[PDB]
Design a protein around this ligand. Structure first.
Ligand SMILES: CCCCCCCCCCCCCCCC(=O)O
Ligand SMILES: CCCCCCCCCCCCCCCC(=O)O
Lengths: 129, 129
């Protein structure tokens, strides 16, 4: 129903392989690969505000689903894309050669980003406030 | 008694002036100044683990009070210093020309970092799980 919450990273797969594939320096990969931080989502209807802890970087993006928005990626590149809401619990987008799916089930968010034959998956759990 | 917990930044004063004085790139100052993230402390006796969201960076430091420690600063430089306990609820350290005081008051943490005539102050609040 609502994505709003603070989510602590529980586990992830292929962080290093994904970050190497998009061109992140090995120095940043090693610094960030073991960080299990907190991301925050605020949802207001179709409007989303994301404060994402991704490795050693914090990225803050804002978008209305269905509208073109400029979003900052891991590389610092700002891409223009459209994020769609599928059902009430799935955010779907594609930028460059990456497909990203953000799925909420109960208190668990599963983020799956596919780049070629690399599937980068993050599992995070809502902090019960 | 215990600093352990997750803390969300509530307010801060003089971020830009402090970050300019320590030489952070202007582009990182502008993107980080409005981020209100979550920092995590894990305390075991005199041993501390910090995962700090500071602007658009995540910094992870460990140390034991009273023992010389190597700590990463906001600029990425590693400094060697000793963190002291003043009372039971204040952590105090000096490095370079900066004095840092971290004070716990119930669910509120206040971090005060003095550099010459600039006082950079962060107030955060415990996330109640
Ligand atoms: C498409 C813009 C974001 C770019 C950053 C990519 C790094 C992974 C992003 C996943 C965050 C999705 C929100 C769920 C919580 C989390 O996994 O932190
Ligand atoms: C002593 C250098 C540590 C890294 C420098 C980053 C500047 C901000 C440090 C403040 C963090 C103190 C912990 C309280 C929680 C918080 O304010 O995020």
């Amino acid at each position: 129903s609502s994505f709003s919450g603070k989510y602590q990273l529980q586990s992830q797969e292929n962080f290093e392989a994904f970050m190497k594939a998009i061109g992140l320096p090995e120095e940043l990969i090693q610094k960030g690969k073991d960080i299990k931080g907190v991301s925050e989502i605020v949802q207001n209807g179709k409007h989303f505000k994301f404060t994402i802890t991704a490795g050693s970087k914090v990225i803050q993006n804002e978008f209305t689903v269905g509208e073109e928005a400029e979003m900052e990626t891991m590389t610092g590149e700002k891409v223009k894309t459209v994020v769609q809401l599928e059902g009430d619990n799935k955010l779907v987008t594609t930028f460059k050669n990456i497909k990203s799916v953000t799925e909420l089930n109960g208190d668990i968010i599963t983020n799956t980003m596919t780049l070629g034959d690399i599937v980068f998956k993050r599992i995070s759990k809502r902090i019960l406030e």
